[PDB]
Amino acid sequence: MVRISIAGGNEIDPGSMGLTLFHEHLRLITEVVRWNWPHLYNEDEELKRAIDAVNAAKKYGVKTIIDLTVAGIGCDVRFNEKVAKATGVNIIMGTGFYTYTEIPFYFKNRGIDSLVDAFVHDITIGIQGTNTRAAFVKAVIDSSGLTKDVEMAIRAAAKAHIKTDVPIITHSFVGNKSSLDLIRIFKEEGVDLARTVIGHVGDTDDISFIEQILREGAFIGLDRFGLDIYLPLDKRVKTAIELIKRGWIDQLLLSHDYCPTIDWYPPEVVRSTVPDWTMTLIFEKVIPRMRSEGITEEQINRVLIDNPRRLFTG
Amino acid sequence: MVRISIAGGNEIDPGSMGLTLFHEHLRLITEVVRWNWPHLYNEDEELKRAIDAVNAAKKYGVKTIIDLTVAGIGCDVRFNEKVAKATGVNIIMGTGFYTYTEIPFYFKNRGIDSLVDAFVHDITIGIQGTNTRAAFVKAVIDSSGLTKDVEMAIRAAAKAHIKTDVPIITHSFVGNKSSLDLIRIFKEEGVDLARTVIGHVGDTDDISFIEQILREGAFIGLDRFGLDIYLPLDKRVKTAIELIKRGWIDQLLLSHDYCPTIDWYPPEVVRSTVPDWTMTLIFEKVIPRMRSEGITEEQINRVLIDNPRRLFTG
Numbered sequence: 001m002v003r004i005s006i007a008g009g010n011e012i013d014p015g016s017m018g019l020t021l022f023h024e025h026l027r028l029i030t031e032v033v034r035w036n037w038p039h040l041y042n043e044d045e046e047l048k049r050a051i052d053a054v055n056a057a058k059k060y061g062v063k064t065i066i067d068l069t070v071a072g073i074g075c076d077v078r079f080n081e082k083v084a085k086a087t088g089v090n091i092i093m094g095t096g097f098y099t100y101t102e103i104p105f106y107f108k109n110r111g112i113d114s115l116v117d118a119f120v121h122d123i124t125i126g127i128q129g130t131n132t133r134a135a136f137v138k139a140v141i142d143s144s145g146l147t148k149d150v151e152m153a154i155r156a157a158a159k160a161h162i163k164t165d166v167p168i169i170t171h172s173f174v175g176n177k178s179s180l181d182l183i184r185i186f187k188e189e190g191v192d193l194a195r196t197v198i199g200h201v202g203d204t205d206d207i208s209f210i211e212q213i214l215r216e217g218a219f220i221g222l223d224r225f226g227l228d229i230y231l232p233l234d235k236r237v238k239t240a241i242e243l244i245k246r247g248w249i250d251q252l253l254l255s256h257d258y259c260p261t262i263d264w265y266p267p268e269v270v271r272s273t274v275p276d277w278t279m280t281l282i283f284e285k286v287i288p289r290m291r292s293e294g295i296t297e298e299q300i301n302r303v304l305i306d307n308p309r310r311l312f313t314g
Numbered sequence: 315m316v317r318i319s320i321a322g323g324n325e326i327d328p329g330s331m332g333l334t335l336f337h338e339h340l341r342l343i344t345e346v347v348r349w350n351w352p353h354l355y356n357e358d359e360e361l362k363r364a365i366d367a368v369n370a371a372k373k374y375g376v377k378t379i380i381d382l383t384v385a386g387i388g389c390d391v392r393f394n395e396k397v398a399k400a401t402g403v404n405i406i407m408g409t410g411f412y413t414y415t416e417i418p419f420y421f422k423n424r425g426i427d428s429l430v431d432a433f434v435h436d437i438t439i440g441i442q443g444t445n446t447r448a449a450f451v452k453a454v455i456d457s458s459g460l461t462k463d464v465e466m467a468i469r470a471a472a473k474a475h476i477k478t479d480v481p482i483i484t485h486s487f488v489g490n491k492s493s494l495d496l497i498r499i500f501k502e503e504g505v506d507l508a509r510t511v512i513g514h515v516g517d518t519d520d521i522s523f524i525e526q527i528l529r530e531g532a533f534i535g536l537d538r539f540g541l542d543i544y545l546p547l548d549k550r551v552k553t554a555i556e557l558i559k560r561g562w563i564d565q566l567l568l569s570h571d572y573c574p575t576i577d578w579y580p581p582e583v584v585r586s587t588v589p590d591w592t593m594t595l596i597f598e599k600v601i602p603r604m605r606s607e608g609i610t611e612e613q614i615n616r617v618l619i620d621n622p623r624r625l626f627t628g
């Protein structure tokens with residue numbers, strides 16, 4: 001019976017997560033830039049935008065949000081504690097190393113075990129000197145594919161899972177075979193695929209490619225609703241309805257991947273280009289369209305409540 | 315007439331730097347690792363090792379140390395303020411972005427001007443929310459050569475120099491042509507080479523390669539005395555004596571590049587492999603050997619006092 005730490009250092013367990021967004025962000029920032037140039041940032045605005053987004057989701061029933069911000073994209077327990085105390089929403093945190101190409105010389109010179117030990121420390125003792133412990137581990141691969149450093153960080157995630165039993169939630173890229181690289185590696189390391197999510201699969205509507213992942217037994221992340229560049233909304237909704245009609249409902253997870261702040265781009269170019277991206281679009285637009293095509297209220301609850309719960313049990 | 319900020323936010327000017335080590339470190343750490351895994355570090359040990367090293371240099375007459383730790387290797391004004399208040403040694407700080415391959419998506423998505431503006435802010439207003447201002451700018455290239463991101467960061471350093479007139483102190487690699495890449499770029503941007511240091515040239519004893527840099531008019535960094543892997547001590551000393559006998563004394567700068575902490579390696583492997591590396595070796599070993607081969611006390615003073623002073627004037 002698993003105990004899930006939440007920001008603030010209380011615990012809950014899989015059965016009490018309730019209605020959950022399994023992949024979102026509160027603040028996505030680049031550590032080396034914020035450390036060195038704090039004049040480029042405004043902590044009061046960042047906190048306000050995050051509290052606003054999380055309160056909007058809370059209005060539609062969200063009890064638990066899983067924050068996918070790990071090392072390399074600005075993981076910050078203390079910032080998350082403030083969001084949690086202001087909103088009353090449970091925030092689940094994780095560990096891992098986010099990169100598409102390289103890892104730090106710190107870990108290249110010491111090897112895979114030093115990275116595994118850092119993740120195992122966050123999972124068993126606490127993130128960043130706190131008693132909030134990581135409840136999952138992340139692995140990342142994108143359009144550069146499987147570089148050596150990427151392969152190391154993915155295998156480290158797999159090994160931390162093997163030691164601690166926390167699930168693995170991933171980031172992949174549908175424009176190459178990266179999702180299948182993740183599957184191969186996890187199988188080489190003995191990971192039970194039912195404890196993993198292959199991420200960002202919602203970015204494609206190619207049913208045959210999706211089913212080739214689903215046949216391995218993993219969950220899939222239909223997890224960027226609202227980011228149309230990628231795959232427009234109408235195709236994302238259509239794909240989710242079709243996968244449910246074809247029998248796959250127990251392997252589906254939904255989310256928006258919302259970033260109330262993301263430092264990678266100026267904010268104006270993001271607001272102009274994906275103006276519908278929020279942490280509530282699944283409630284305002286996706287779920288009504290699914291219901292009006294015959295998806296049941298219970299089927300929605302299975303996806304948004306049971307599937308996350310089951311990811312975190314077994 | 316130039317004002318040089320020092321850690322703590324006092325100012326001095328080139329004439330009062332006095333006996334100077336132009337390239338050293340107080341603490342070299344990886345921001346993303348220390349931000350995310352503070353359990354791997356001990357701030358009290360790091361501070362003590364830095365205060366100890368700086369007091370040892372102070373015993374031999376050092377008044378001013380230039381800290382070459384910039385963004386990407388853990389630049390931290392507040393840590394440096396503590397070292398300064400404890401030791402009474404002037405600490406000069408800089409700006410730039412340290413990398414051998416990639417720069418953050420933050421700057422790739424906004425372009426070279428956003429990096430120039432970050433450096434110009436540190437030089438004219440202050441580093442990290444303080445009134446300690448950067449007094450030089452750094453540019454870096456190593457064994458991967460001139461990647462696109464590296465080229466951007468080098469040109470940004472050149473442009474910040476063109477706006478603000480602070481000197482440029484560089485890191486290069488003698489095993490390829492990187493030193494000459496720096497020279498070409500600085501010339502394309504209109505930089506006066508007498509306001510630059512081509513770094514880590516002391517890692518070679520090939521007189522003909524060194525003179526090809528000296529002929530361009532830049533200073534050179536004979537700046538890793540004590541790191542024998544690279545080029546043993548006896549050859550480094552011999553090269554400095556020969557360059558002075560061949561007429562080059564006004565273009566020579568000496569230092570140890572000492573890191574009281576460096577997170578890239580476990581400490582034991584560093585202590586075992588370069589056991590003589592300290593912030594005092596130039597005083598205990600190099601200068602006596604130079605004097606006993608006929609280098610004058612005034613020639614030593616020209617190198618350790620006038621050359622840094624002149625780097626910072628014009």
Ligand SMILES: CCCCCCCCCCCCCC(=O)O
Nearest residue numbers: 171229257262265269270273274
């Ligand atoms: C092309 C300029 C504006 C495009 C806006 C796209 C916003 C980028 C979304 C960030 C991708 C999600 C991050 C991640 O979770 O891995």
Ligand SMILES: CCCCCCCCCCCCCC(=O)O
Nearest residue numbers: 485543571576579583584587588
């Ligand atoms: C090969 C294992 C131990 C080797 C010890 C070498 C210590 C590395 C020195 C760091 C290089 C200077 C950093 C820099 O200033 O750019």
Ligand SMILES: [Co+2]
Nearest residue numbers: 171172199200
């Ligand atoms: Co992602």
Ligand SMILES: [Co+2]
Nearest residue numbers: 024025068257
């Ligand atoms: Co994400």
Ligand SMILES: [Co+2]
Nearest residue numbers: 485486513514
């Ligand atoms: Co260097």
Ligand SMILES: [Co+2]
Nearest residue numbers: 338339382571
């Ligand atoms: Co250095």
